[PDB]
Amino acid sequence: MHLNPAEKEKLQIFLASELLLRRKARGLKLNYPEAVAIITSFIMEGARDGKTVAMLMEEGKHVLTRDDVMEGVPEMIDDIQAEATFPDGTKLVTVHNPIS
């Protein structure tokens, strides 16, 4: 596979997001690391899908809403940043105040 250090680490975000998604599906209000993992993986998968950085900056604000998360979590997350390989190489996505 030729995994580099970043690829190995980023697998763990996908796994955390899968864990978090299962928790959300059984009715739990998500906590801080769960919410960050879901949004982060969505961005990385969006890059893989070929979306633009601008599309993901927009979409990342609509992945989770306040009713999906515990009290205070929206205010704990000022931004979520992720780097992924777009069709035009690695780019940084910053989602500001992802959960209102």
Binding site: E71, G72, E75, M76
Partner: protein, 122 residues
């Protein structure tokens, strides 16, 4: 009540900066064609040569703006700024090499500024 983890509950009031120091308002023009931004703590007389202002009025002073902020001059922009006095020992070293000692040596600072083309001497 709703808990925002780590939130502040600030006291009432306002914080006055550079209290007790003389304040001076001067007009400054960016005569250059590129933008110039000036930090709060740069000795004002030693800013970019293409800023035109009464250089003597920048001696021993700096912008009276919150620590770590800056004033911006777009190309050709002229505006007023408010200066405050430098404190401590009131000595400046380095920067544009116009002072290198006490800011009380106005004649020497201005002589150097004029010889090097810092606009607005006299």
């Amino acid at each position: 009540n709703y808990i925002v983890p780590g939130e502040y509950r600030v006291a009432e009031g306002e914080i006055e900066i550079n209290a007790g120091r003389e304040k001076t308002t001067i007009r400054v023009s960016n005569t250059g064609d590129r933008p110039i931004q000036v930090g709060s703590h740069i000795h004002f007389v030693e800013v970019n040569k293409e800023l035109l202002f009464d250089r003597a009025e920048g001696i021993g002073r700096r912008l009276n703006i919150p620590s770590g902020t800056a004033a911006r001059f777009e190309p050709g922009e002229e505006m007023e700024v408010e200066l405050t006095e430098l404190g401590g020992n009131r000595e400046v070293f380095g920067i544009s090499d116009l002072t290198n000692g006490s800011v009380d040596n106005k004649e020497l600072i201005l002589q150097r500024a004029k010889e090097l083309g810092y606009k607005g001497v006299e």
